[PDB]
């Protein structure tokens, strides 16, 4: 029942009781661990709403109060009457912040309580969605001084009137398959980039074409929109020593804004809930830039450094990797754009974890996602045992809309 | 039931059915994953079924399942168990067992080599001096003047739990660690407790930063005895850098033979509490963990200073830059001295090929992602992008409590 996690670098042992409140499954069993797998009714709703409201009133020190009982009956009546219910603004804010607090794969949760919540539940059309999104982008970007935020559109009703942001992130680059058989731009977005074309977008066919927003409101067909270029902050990447680095012509955007996940609060499902914070260096420098399936730029950079790429044991890939990440961080910092390196971010997560254990009795964490993609063991989280479990409110994965939409 | 795993870099999807032959638990449940947790005398009753399962596996491997030889062996073992409460493995079954324990080790990235293991049968051993002799022979054989050969030495199995054979060292070759009164540590911090035990047992410590520890050996449940491994049998490599001439002046070196000696080997229900095994190093084990862990030699700063990196702020990634150079030095040194070693790129690439082969010929390959992915440059190695399934198959290597915590001293 009571589990303990130890840090093998400090010997610090923490006891976890919070997992005892876990509701959803993990995918693992007593016979098999799937820890490395990426994607492992009124009668149903009231229980979920009750669980949520109970934690909410408990958080505001009014558990078992008349107000608690009142709201709890009001929702029951509303569900029985409308087969669903609406959250109070206070509950919505609490729920979104806690979905982040509960995100086991997020290393920056020390920032969880500082989240700007934009209530877009009054939205009805795709143009309205575009407007809300532009405002979120402008607010969150804040001229480089990034501020975490989330915009919440109308909750699911009958599943045939769902709001959805077809993009995977508010801001991403297009990808096109060239005759050469090679891919131009970001291979990760090749399919989405084609759907935009299939819709009318005039692809400039560059290495970094900021994709258009494909917005779906109330279940209708998605519409394109070009985010005001003036609102998309980008950072040209240059190295603080290698003047030839700028010649690679690489750049990245400052705002990471996941837009394809589903926010679940008190049983309610918000299928369109774009959220953003700020980047951890490795996300761009290691994954976006060096993944073989992404921009895959290691070799190019290696050649420019004149490294011995004849043998893997020369560790040329590793040397180049470091340089590419020093640059990314240097570029963002030079342009005054918020960004955090993997050492600072992991150190903060450890602190957060400790705070969470002594104040909440635990902190669900997915080691596989928390440990940075480079220099793993020189960051504190590598040596930190973690318990992964699912707590709600939560951010969940959901099927891409183009594989479920009925035009 | 079929379970699929996908490699997100190649989209290759594999199907696992081997997990169905898994018996042991993992530590996880449908409500909680313990995938990052380091460490989540039998009776006749539970022993014959374990023997049968193993013998069935053995006879199937040699294409003699159901044969008279198979049936007679099962009968022979059954009689032996009811007669003596235990049983002895035939040499062939011991070899098959040891190789499969390696084949089944989910945390081992070098398993492509599993079928190539020299098994030394030391079940006739009765004393600590006998254990020392066997261990010297293992080290000399395995070292092979730098051309490392994988090997395992298997001492007598557990009987009543009061006559266990144990190698108290965690590895046959390791450096001593000494806690100074000022709170600092001389040598390898990971071995301070064991070093103190050795000193107490009579070892005269030279108190240097790289002193090869003596062997502390326990035979037949008796108190352990100290032995010094012949220096001429301990191969070491001075660490230097191909471009930085000052690197050698850090006074660093390491031993060439990694020989884990504190695990338990379970074969057909039998427990071999003393079963030292060795292969060869993957660079990062030394360059990343042994040298750069804050709790080990912790050399990142001293190296970073010499390279004169901007140690003012972490965003300069000086720790990362130094880490790479140290690992370059480790590989370069071993290669230059002609001592077998594999870099993490080569090792993980081979593991992926091995894993795919296992899925196709065996129906699976249990693997612990947390341990398989190297401690540096994780995502630039293929294993990072490979989904894995972790489950426990026997024969297997298991952890066991340190002997000093359970041993009943006879004095
Ligand atoms: C303040 C800055 C923040 C930092 C530095 C941070 C950092 C990270 C990192 C490095 C990852 C892994 C990304 C990947 O590998 O694809 C991650 C994942 C995630 N973060 Fe955070 N995060 C921040 C803000 C946010 C915000 C504002 C939310 C929600 C309101 C959030 C929710 C999540 C979730 C749900 C995931 C997993 C997404 C997935 O499964 O693909 N994060 N975060
Ligand atoms: C031939 C070269 C070999 C290589 C390159 C290799 C590499 C590795 C590495 C990198 C680890 C992780 C070590 C750590 O993080 O402490 C490991 C673990 C392991 N290997 Fe291998 N290995 C090899 C041979 C062997 C042999 C001969 C056996 C057994 C017959 C074996 C059994 C295991 C086991 C059981 C573990 C886990 C140990 C633990 O839990 O502490 N390995 N191996
Ligand atoms: C197969 C494996 O689960 C996959 O490559 C995971 C590993 N860890 C990760 N960690 C983070 N932060 N992000 C990812 O996309 C991944 N991918
Ligand atoms: C807490 C966490 O499980 C621990 O630090 C693990 C992570 N991965 C590892 N991987 C290897 N190969 N060796 C280790 O000792 C560890 N330690
Ligand atoms: N820090 C964040 N909020 N990240 C969200 C995911 C961004 C993704 N890892 C990327 O590199 O584009
Ligand atoms: N390749 C091996 N057989 N390794 C065994 C473990 C060695 C241990 N990681 C060390 O650095 O000493
Ligand atoms: Zn698990």
| Number of DSSP strand runs of chain A | 15
Per DSSP, what share of the residues of chain A sits in E-state strands of 2 or more residues? 5-15%
Enumerate the distinct ligands.
protoporphyrin IX containing FE, 5,6,7,8-tetrahydrobiopterin, arginine, zinc ion
- Count of folded domains of chain A: 3
Oligomer state of the chains in this structure: homodimer
Q: Biggest β-sheet of chain A, characterized?
A: 3 strands, mixed
CATH topology of the largest domain in chain A: Nitric Oxide Synthase, Chain A, domain 1
CATH superfamily of the largest domain in chain A: Nitric Oxide Synthase, Chain A, domain 1
Largest contact between chains? A-B, 65 and 64 residues
As a percent range, the share of helical residues of chain A equals 25-40%
End-to-end C-alpha gap of chain A: 49 Å
| Helix and strand element order of chain A | EEHHHEHEEEEHEEEEEEEHHHHHE
**What is the CATH-assigned architecture of the largest domain in chain A?**
Alpha-Beta Complex
Strand order of the largest sheet of chain A: 3-4-14
Envelope shape of chain A: globular
The tally of helices of chain A reads 10
Could you say which structural class the secondary elements and strand pairing of chain A correspond to? alpha+beta
Computed Rg of chain A: 23 Å
Please identify the top-level CATH class of the largest domain in chain A: Alpha Beta
Family (chain B): Belongs to the NOS family.
GO molecular function (chain B): ATPase binding; cadmium ion binding; calcium-dependent protein binding; calmodulin binding; enzyme binding; flavin adenine dinucleotide binding; FMN binding; heme binding
Keywords (chain B): Calmodulin-binding, Cell membrane, Cell projection, FAD, Flavoprotein, FMN, Heme, Iron, Membrane, Metal-binding, NADP, Oxidoreductase, Phosphoprotein, Synapse, Ubl conjugation
GO biological process, one term (chain B): potassium ion transport
């Amino acid at each position: 029942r009571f589990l303990k996690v130890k840090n093998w670098e400090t010997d610090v042992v923490l006891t976890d009781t919070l997992h005892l409140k876990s509701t959803l499954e993990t995918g693992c069993t007593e016979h098999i661990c799937m820890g490395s797998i990426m994607l492992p009714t009124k009668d149903q709703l009231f229980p979920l709403a009750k669980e949520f409201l109970d934690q909410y009133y408990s958080s505001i020190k009014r558990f078992g109060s008349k107000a608690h009982m009142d709201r709890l009956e009001e929702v029951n009546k509303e569900i029985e009457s409308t087969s669903t219910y609406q959250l109070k603004d206070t509950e919505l804010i609490y729920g979104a912040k806690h979905a982040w607090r509960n995100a086991s794969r997020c290393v920056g949760r020390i920032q969880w309580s500082k989240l700007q919540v934009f209530d877009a539940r009054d939205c009805t059309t795709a143009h309205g969605m575009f407007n809300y999104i532009c405002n979120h982008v402008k607010y969150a970007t804040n001229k480089g001084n990034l501020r975490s935020a989330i915009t919440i559109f109308p909750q699911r009703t009958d599943g045939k009137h769902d709001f959805r942001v077809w993009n995977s992130q508010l801001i991403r680059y297009a990808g096109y398959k060239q005759p050469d058989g090679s891919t131009l731009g970001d291979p990760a977005n090749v399919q989405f980039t084609e759907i935009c074309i299939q819709q009318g977008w005039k692809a400039p066919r560059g290495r970094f074409d900021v994709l258009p927003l494909l917005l779906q409101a109330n279940g209708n067909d998605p519409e394109l929109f070009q985010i005001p270029p003036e609102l998309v902050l980008e950072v040209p990447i240059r190295h603080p020593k290698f003047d030839w680095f700028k010649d690679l012509g690489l750049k990245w955007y400052g705002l990471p804004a996941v837009s394809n996940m589903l926010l679940e609060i008190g049983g309610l499902e918000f299928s369109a809930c774009p959220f953003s914070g700020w980047y951890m260096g490795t996300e761009i420098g290691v994954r976006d830039y060096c993944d073989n399936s992404r921009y895959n730029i290691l070799e190019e950079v290696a050649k420019k450094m004149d490294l011995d790429m004849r043998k893997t044991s020369s560790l040329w890939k590793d040397q180049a990797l470091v340089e590419i990440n020093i640059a990314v961080l240097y570029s963002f910092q030079s342009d005054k754009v918020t960004i955090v390196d993997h050492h600072s971010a992991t150190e903060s997560f450890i602190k957060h974890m400790e705070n969470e254990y002594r104040c909440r009795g635990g902190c669900p964490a997915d080691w596989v996602w928390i440990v940075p993609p480079m220099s793993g063991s020189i960051t504190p989280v590598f040596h930190q045992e973690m318990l992964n479990y699912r707590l709600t409110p939560s951010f969940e994965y959901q099927p891409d809309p183009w594989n479920t939409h009925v035009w």
